[PDB]
Protein backbone atom coordinates (compact mmCIF):
# COMPACT_ATOMS: atom_id res chain seq x y z
CA UNK A 1 0.00 0.00 0.00
CA UNK A 2 0.96 3.68 -0.26
CA UNK A 3 0.36 5.55 2.96
CA UNK A 4 0.99 8.95 4.46
CA UNK A 5 3.68 9.14 7.16
CA UNK A 6 3.81 11.64 10.03
CA UNK A 7 6.01 13.81 7.78
CA UNK A 8 3.06 14.00 5.39
CA UNK A 9 4.84 12.24 2.52
CA UNK A 10 3.23 9.41 0.59
CA UNK A 11 5.43 6.34 0.99
CA UNK A 12 5.14 2.69 0.12
CA UNK A 13 4.56 0.27 2.97
CA UNK A 14 4.55 -3.51 2.79
CA UNK A 15 1.14 -5.17 2.86
CA UNK A 16 0.48 -6.24 6.43
CA UNK A 17 0.30 -9.84 7.71
CA UNK A 18 -3.00 -8.92 9.37
CA UNK A 19 -4.45 -7.67 6.07
CA UNK A 20 -3.32 -10.74 4.13
CA UNK A 21 -4.82 -13.16 6.65
CA UNK A 22 -8.04 -11.15 6.90
CA UNK A 23 -8.71 -11.37 3.14
CA UNK A 24 -7.88 -15.09 2.95
CA UNK A 25 -10.12 -15.78 5.94
CA UNK A 26 -13.08 -13.73 4.67
CA UNK A 27 -13.11 -15.72 1.43
CA UNK A 28 -12.82 -19.01 3.38
CA UNK A 29 -15.69 -18.17 5.76
CA UNK A 30 -18.08 -16.08 3.61
CA UNK A 31 -17.09 -17.43 0.17
CA UNK A 32 -18.54 -15.00 -2.41
CA UNK A 33 -21.41 -13.58 -0.39
CA UNK A 34 -21.98 -9.94 -1.41
CA UNK A 35 -20.49 -8.61 1.84
CA UNK A 36 -17.06 -9.86 0.69
CA UNK A 37 -16.85 -7.05 -1.86
CA UNK A 38 -17.05 -4.14 0.65
CA UNK A 39 -14.40 -5.94 2.72
CA UNK A 40 -12.11 -6.33 -0.28
CA UNK A 41 -12.52 -2.64 -1.08
CA UNK A 42 -11.86 -1.68 2.56
CA UNK A 43 -8.90 -4.08 3.07
CA UNK A 44 -7.26 -2.84 -0.15
CA UNK A 45 -7.08 0.80 0.94
CA UNK A 46 -4.07 2.48 -0.63
CA UNK A 47 -3.14 -0.68 -2.54
CA UNK A 48 -0.73 -0.70 -5.41
CA UNK A 49 -1.67 -2.86 -8.41
CA UNK A 50 0.84 -5.38 -7.07
CA UNK A 51 -0.95 -5.51 -3.72
CA UNK A 52 -4.34 -6.03 -5.34
CA UNK A 53 -2.97 -8.88 -7.42
CA UNK A 54 -1.36 -10.37 -4.30
CA UNK A 55 -4.67 -10.41 -2.43
CA UNK A 56 -6.38 -12.09 -5.38
CA UNK A 57 -3.47 -14.49 -5.91
CA UNK A 58 -3.40 -15.59 -2.24
CA UNK A 59 -6.95 -16.94 -2.53
CA UNK A 60 -6.56 -20.68 -2.83
CA UNK A 61 -9.94 -22.05 -3.84
CA UNK A 62 -12.63 -20.74 -6.17
CA UNK A 63 -10.25 -20.78 -9.15
CA UNK A 64 -13.14 -20.83 -11.60
CA UNK A 65 -14.16 -17.41 -10.30
CA UNK A 66 -10.56 -16.14 -10.37
CA UNK A 67 -10.21 -17.02 -14.06
CA UNK A 68 -13.48 -15.15 -14.67
CA UNK A 69 -11.99 -12.18 -12.83
CA UNK A 70 -8.96 -12.29 -15.14
CA UNK A 71 -11.24 -12.23 -18.19
CA UNK A 72 -13.14 -9.23 -16.84
CA UNK A 73 -9.90 -7.40 -16.00
CA UNK A 74 -8.60 -8.09 -19.51
CA UNK A 75 -11.84 -6.82 -21.10
CA UNK A 76 -11.68 -3.61 -19.05
CA UNK A 77 -7.96 -3.25 -19.82
CA UNK A 78 -8.72 -3.39 -23.55
CA UNK A 79 -11.31 -0.61 -23.23
CA UNK A 80 -8.71 1.49 -21.38
CA UNK A 81 -6.15 1.04 -24.15
CA UNK A 82 -8.86 1.85 -26.72
CA UNK A 83 -9.97 5.01 -24.86
CA UNK A 84 -6.41 6.20 -24.23
CA UNK A 85 -4.57 4.84 -27.29
CA UNK A 86 -2.04 7.70 -27.12
CA UNK A 87 1.49 6.41 -27.62
CA UNK A 88 4.32 8.83 -26.85
CA UNK A 89 10.55 12.23 -22.93
CA UNK A 90 8.92 14.67 -20.47
CA UNK A 91 11.47 13.50 -17.86
CA UNK A 92 8.61 11.74 -16.08
CA UNK A 93 6.65 8.85 -17.56
CA UNK A 94 3.06 10.02 -18.10
CA UNK A 95 1.63 7.11 -20.08
CA UNK A 96 0.18 4.03 -18.38
CA UNK A 97 -1.13 1.09 -20.36
CA UNK A 98 -3.94 -1.27 -19.43
CA UNK A 99 -1.38 -3.97 -18.62
CA UNK A 100 0.58 -1.45 -16.54
CA UNK A 101 -2.57 -0.63 -14.57
CA UNK A 102 -3.17 -4.37 -14.09
CA UNK A 103 0.41 -4.77 -12.78
CA UNK A 104 1.50 -7.12 -15.58
CA UNK A 105 4.00 -4.85 -17.36
CA UNK A 106 4.70 -2.28 -14.63
CA UNK A 107 7.26 -2.26 -11.85
CA UNK A 108 6.43 -1.43 -8.27
CA UNK A 109 8.48 1.76 -8.66
CA UNK A 110 6.48 2.71 -11.76
CA UNK A 111 3.25 2.02 -9.87
CA UNK A 112 4.45 4.23 -6.98
CA UNK A 113 5.42 6.99 -9.41
CA UNK A 114 1.93 7.31 -10.92
CA UNK A 115 0.09 7.05 -7.59
CA UNK A 116 2.41 9.57 -5.95
CA UNK A 117 2.53 12.03 -8.83
CA UNK A 118 0.99 15.48 -8.51
CA UNK A 119 -1.49 15.20 -10.15
CA UNK A 120 -1.95 11.51 -9.30
CA UNK A 121 -2.76 8.78 -11.81
CA UNK A 122 -4.63 6.42 -9.44
CA UNK A 123 -3.76 3.13 -11.11
CA UNK A 124 -4.61 1.29 -7.90
CA UNK A 125 -8.09 2.80 -7.75
CA UNK A 126 -8.66 2.18 -11.45
CA UNK A 127 -7.54 -1.43 -11.20
CA UNK A 128 -9.65 -1.93 -8.07
CA UNK A 129 -12.69 -0.65 -9.97
CA UNK A 130 -12.16 -3.29 -12.67
CA UNK A 131 -11.65 -6.00 -10.03
CA UNK A 132 -14.79 -5.01 -8.13
CA UNK A 133 -16.75 -5.14 -11.39
CA UNK A 134 -15.49 -8.69 -11.80
CA UNK A 135 -16.25 -9.68 -8.22
CA UNK A 136 -19.78 -8.31 -8.57
CA UNK A 137 -20.33 -10.67 -11.55
CA UNK A 138 -19.04 -13.62 -9.51
CA UNK A 139 -21.45 -12.80 -6.67
CA UNK A 140 -24.43 -12.93 -9.11
CA UNK A 141 -23.35 -16.25 -10.51
CA UNK A 142 -23.10 -17.62 -7.01
CA UNK A 143 -26.52 -16.37 -5.90
CA UNK A 144 -28.31 -19.71 -5.31
CA UNK A 145 -31.88 -18.41 -5.65
CA UNK A 146 -33.96 -16.08 -7.82
CA UNK A 147 -35.87 -13.26 -6.09
CA UNK A 148 -39.09 -14.75 -7.53
CA UNK A 149 -38.69 -17.89 -5.37
CA UNK A 150 -38.69 -16.10 -2.00
CA UNK A 151 -42.18 -16.54 -0.52
CA UNK A 152 -43.11 -16.21 3.12
CA UNK A 153 -44.04 -19.45 4.83
CA UNK A 154 -47.35 -19.75 6.70
CA UNK A 155 -45.47 -19.67 10.02
CA UNK A 156 -42.43 -17.66 8.92
CA UNK A 157 -42.11 -14.38 10.85
CA UNK A 158 -42.36 -11.42 8.53
CA UNK A 159 -38.93 -10.24 9.72
CA UNK A 160 -37.31 -13.53 8.69
CA UNK A 161 -38.98 -13.46 5.25
CA UNK A 162 -37.92 -9.83 4.69
CA UNK A 163 -34.34 -10.80 5.59
CA UNK A 164 -34.45 -13.55 2.96
CA UNK A 165 -36.05 -11.25 0.40
CA UNK A 166 -33.49 -8.44 0.60
CA UNK A 167 -30.56 -10.84 1.09
CA UNK A 168 -31.38 -12.58 -2.21
CA UNK A 169 -32.04 -9.26 -3.99
CA UNK A 170 -28.60 -7.99 -2.99
CA UNK A 171 -26.85 -11.01 -4.52
CA UNK A 172 -28.87 -11.05 -7.75
CA UNK A 173 -28.05 -7.43 -8.53
CA UNK A 174 -24.71 -7.33 -6.61
CA UNK A 175 -25.93 -4.18 -4.84
CA UNK A 176 -28.60 -3.05 -2.38
CA UNK A 177 -29.95 0.00 -4.29
CA UNK A 178 -32.63 -2.17 -5.86
CA UNK A 179 -35.91 -0.99 -4.30
CA UNK A 180 -37.65 -0.30 -7.55
CA UNK A 181 -41.45 -0.30 -7.41
CA UNK A 182 -41.46 -3.86 -8.76
CA UNK A 183 -39.38 -5.12 -5.83
CA UNK A 184 -41.83 -3.40 -3.47
CA UNK A 185 -44.67 -4.98 -5.44
CA UNK A 186 -43.09 -8.43 -5.25
CA UNK A 187 -42.60 -8.30 -1.47
CA UNK A 188 -46.36 -7.97 -0.94
CA UNK A 189 -47.31 -10.39 -3.72
CA UNK A 190 -45.06 -13.12 -2.28
CA UNK A 191 -46.07 -12.55 1.40
CA UNK A 192 -48.37 -14.98 3.19
CA UNK A 193 -52.13 -14.38 3.28
CA UNK A 194 -52.53 -12.84 6.75
CA UNK A 195 -49.66 -10.35 6.48
CA UNK A 196 -50.63 -9.37 2.95
CA UNK A 197 -54.12 -8.18 4.01
CA UNK A 198 -52.43 -6.08 6.68
CA UNK A 199 -49.88 -4.77 4.18
CA UNK A 200 -52.61 -4.07 1.63
CA UNK A 201 -54.52 -2.06 4.22
CA UNK A 202 -51.46 0.05 5.05
CA UNK A 203 -51.70 1.79 1.68
CA UNK A 204 -49.06 3.27 -0.62
CA UNK A 205 -45.83 4.83 0.57
CA UNK A 206 -45.50 2.66 3.66
CA UNK A 207 -42.01 2.48 5.08
CA UNK A 208 -40.35 -0.86 5.71
CA UNK A 209 -40.49 -0.02 9.42
CA UNK A 210 -44.26 0.51 9.20
CA UNK A 211 -44.82 -2.73 7.28
CA UNK A 212 -42.74 -4.82 9.70
CA UNK A 213 -44.42 -3.26 12.75
CA UNK A 214 -47.85 -3.78 11.16
CA UNK A 215 -47.03 -7.46 10.55
CA UNK A 216 -45.62 -7.89 14.04
CA UNK A 217 -47.66 -10.55 15.74
CA UNK A 218 -49.22 -12.33 12.73
CA UNK A 219 -49.56 -15.39 14.96
CA UNK A 220 -46.23 -17.25 14.57
Amino acid sequence: PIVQNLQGQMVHQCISPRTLNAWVKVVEEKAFSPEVIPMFSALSCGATPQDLNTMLNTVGGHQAAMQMLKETINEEAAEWDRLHPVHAAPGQMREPRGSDIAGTTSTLQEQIGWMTHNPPIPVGEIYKRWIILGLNKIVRMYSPTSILDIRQGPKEPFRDYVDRFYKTLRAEQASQEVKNAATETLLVQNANPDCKTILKALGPGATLEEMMTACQGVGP
Partner: nanobody
Amino acid sequence: DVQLQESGGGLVQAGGSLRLSCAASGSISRFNAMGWWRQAPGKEREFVARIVKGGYAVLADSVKGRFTISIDSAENTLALQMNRLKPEDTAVYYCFAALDTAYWGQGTQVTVS
Protein backbone atom coordinates in the same frame (compact mmCIF):
# COMPACT_ATOMS: atom_id res chain seq x y z
CA ASP B 1 -61.12 -12.09 19.30
CA VAL B 2 -61.07 -8.46 18.09
CA GLN B 3 -64.09 -6.53 16.77
CA LEU B 4 -64.01 -2.85 15.78
CA GLN B 5 -66.89 -0.53 14.70
CA GLU B 6 -66.95 3.05 13.31
CA SER B 7 -69.41 5.77 14.31
CA GLY B 8 -70.04 9.48 13.98
CA GLY B 9 -71.17 9.41 10.37
CA GLY B 10 -73.95 11.35 8.77
CA LEU B 11 -74.95 14.04 6.29
CA VAL B 12 -73.01 17.30 6.25
CA GLN B 13 -73.02 20.37 4.05
CA ALA B 14 -70.39 21.20 1.49
CA GLY B 15 -67.78 23.17 3.31
CA GLY B 16 -68.21 21.41 6.64
CA SER B 17 -66.45 19.42 9.33
CA LEU B 18 -67.16 16.15 11.11
CA ARG B 19 -65.36 13.95 13.62
CA LEU B 20 -65.45 10.19 13.00
CA SER B 21 -64.50 7.70 15.69
CA CYS B 22 -63.37 4.08 15.45
CA ALA B 23 -64.08 2.06 18.61
CA ALA B 24 -61.86 -0.95 19.45
CA SER B 25 -62.41 -3.88 21.80
CA GLY B 26 -59.70 -4.33 24.31
CA SER B 27 -56.85 -1.85 24.64
CA ILE B 28 -55.83 0.21 21.62
CA SER B 29 -52.13 0.10 22.56
CA ARG B 30 -52.07 -3.61 21.67
CA PHE B 31 -52.72 -2.98 17.98
CA ASN B 32 -49.52 -2.59 15.98
CA ALA B 33 -51.12 -0.35 13.32
CA MET B 34 -54.52 1.20 12.65
CA GLY B 35 -55.98 3.39 9.95
CA TRP B 36 -58.80 4.51 7.67
CA TRP B 37 -59.92 3.74 4.12
CA ARG B 38 -62.84 5.03 2.09
CA GLN B 39 -64.66 3.98 -1.07
CA ALA B 40 -67.04 5.97 -3.02
CA PRO B 41 -69.84 4.14 -4.86
CA GLY B 42 -68.54 2.86 -8.19
CA LYS B 43 -64.95 4.03 -7.43
CA GLU B 44 -61.95 1.92 -6.47
CA ARG B 45 -61.04 1.64 -2.80
CA GLU B 46 -59.09 4.78 -1.87
CA PHE B 47 -56.50 5.07 0.90
CA VAL B 48 -57.12 7.64 3.64
CA ALA B 49 -54.91 7.33 6.77
CA ARG B 50 -52.57 5.00 8.74
CA ILE B 51 -51.00 5.06 12.24
CA VAL B 52 -48.38 2.43 13.15
CA LYS B 53 -47.39 1.71 16.77
CA GLY B 54 -44.62 4.11 17.75
CA GLY B 55 -45.22 6.08 14.59
CA TYR B 56 -46.26 9.44 13.29
CA ALA B 57 -49.44 9.47 11.30
CA VAL B 58 -49.21 9.70 7.53
CA LEU B 59 -52.10 11.12 5.53
CA ALA B 60 -53.25 10.91 1.92
CA ASP B 61 -52.62 13.81 -0.47
CA SER B 62 -56.34 14.49 -1.22
CA VAL B 63 -56.81 15.19 2.53
CA LYS B 64 -53.25 16.13 3.58
CA GLY B 65 -54.08 19.72 4.42
CA ARG B 66 -57.24 18.93 6.38
CA PHE B 67 -58.25 15.73 8.20
CA THR B 68 -56.53 14.68 11.45
CA ILE B 69 -56.20 11.25 13.09
CA SER B 70 -55.93 10.79 16.84
CA ILE B 71 -55.62 8.03 19.42
CA ASP B 72 -57.21 8.11 22.85
CA SER B 73 -55.59 5.35 24.84
CA ALA B 74 -57.80 6.29 27.81
CA GLU B 75 -61.07 5.78 25.89
CA ASN B 76 -59.57 3.08 23.61
CA THR B 77 -60.69 4.84 20.45
CA LEU B 78 -58.99 6.08 17.28
CA ALA B 79 -60.54 9.35 16.04
CA LEU B 80 -60.47 10.92 12.60
CA GLN B 81 -61.55 14.57 12.68
CA MET B 82 -62.74 15.72 9.30
CA ASN B 83 -62.65 19.39 8.44
CA ARG B 84 -63.16 21.48 5.30
CA LEU B 85 -65.33 18.80 3.73
CA LYS B 86 -65.92 18.90 -0.04
CA PRO B 87 -68.84 17.43 -2.00
CA GLU B 88 -66.47 14.82 -3.48
CA ASP B 89 -65.85 13.51 0.05
CA THR B 90 -69.23 11.78 0.01
CA ALA B 91 -68.20 8.12 0.17
CA VAL B 92 -68.33 5.00 2.28
CA TYR B 93 -65.71 5.06 5.07
CA TYR B 94 -64.01 1.99 6.64
CA CYS B 95 -61.61 1.71 9.62
CA PHE B 96 -58.87 -0.96 9.84
CA ALA B 97 -56.72 -2.44 12.68
CA ALA B 98 -53.63 -4.70 12.59
CA LEU B 99 -52.95 -7.57 15.04
CA ASP B 100 -52.63 -11.27 14.08
CA THR B 101 -54.38 -10.32 10.84
CA ALA B 102 -56.14 -7.22 9.56
CA TYR B 103 -59.60 -6.52 10.97
CA TRP B 104 -62.10 -4.07 9.48
CA GLY B 105 -65.28 -2.47 10.66
CA GLN B 106 -68.33 -2.50 8.44
CA GLY B 107 -68.04 1.24 7.83
CA THR B 108 -69.97 4.46 8.38
CA GLN B 109 -71.51 6.57 5.63
CA VAL B 110 -70.35 10.18 5.10
CA THR B 111 -72.44 12.32 2.72
CA VAL B 112 -71.53 15.85 1.60
CA SER B 113 -74.18 17.83 -0.32
